């Protein structure tokens, strides 16, 4: 993929954001921005420039599902890739997310290999 692709990493924990950012760096992706919740994320996204979103599920203010639905209904970002990275793993939620258009899902804790593979996968697709 375009090494210049702009990623948005959304998670309440800076440590998790750090992990994701580092792995992206490993893959050759350095154009990364961070967000603490769905609202901040959406705010940045609407400002323009993004090519990929990595987000947690349960978040204050605006959760991953709402973020996802909002993105999918947007006139410009409807197809924006959205990778869920979260501790959440209930069948119901996987379904709802699948239904809503999530591009992928990685369960925390994840191995570097897992995240990287899923990433590559989405780029595929």
């Amino acid at each position: 993929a375009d090494k210049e692709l702009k990623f948005l990493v959304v998670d309440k924990f800076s440590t998790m954001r750090r992990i994701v950012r580092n792995l992206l760096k490993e893959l050759g992706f350095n154009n990364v921005e961070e967000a603490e919740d769905g609202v901040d994320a959406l705010n940045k996204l609407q400002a323009g420039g993004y090519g990929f979103v990595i987000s947690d599920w349960n978040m204050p203010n605006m959760d991953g599902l709402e973020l996802l639905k909002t993105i999918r209904a947007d006139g410009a970002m409807s197809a924006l890739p959205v990778l869920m990275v979260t501790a959440e793993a209930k069948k119901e939620n996987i379904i709802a997310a699948a239904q809503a258009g999530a591009s992928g899902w990685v369960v925390k804790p994840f191995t570097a290999a897992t995240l990287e593979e899923k990433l590559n996968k989405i780029f595929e697709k």
């Binding site: 869920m84 793993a89 209930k90 069948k91 119901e92 996987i94 379904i95 997310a97 699948a98 999530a102 992928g104 899902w105 990685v106 369960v107 994840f110 897992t114 899923k118 996968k121």
Partner: peptide
């Protein structure tokens, strides 16, 4: 019902 990465993989990845 908790799905494993593998299981989830079958529907989302």
């Amino acid at each position: 019902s908790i799905l494993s990465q593998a299981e989830i993989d079958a529907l989302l990845n």
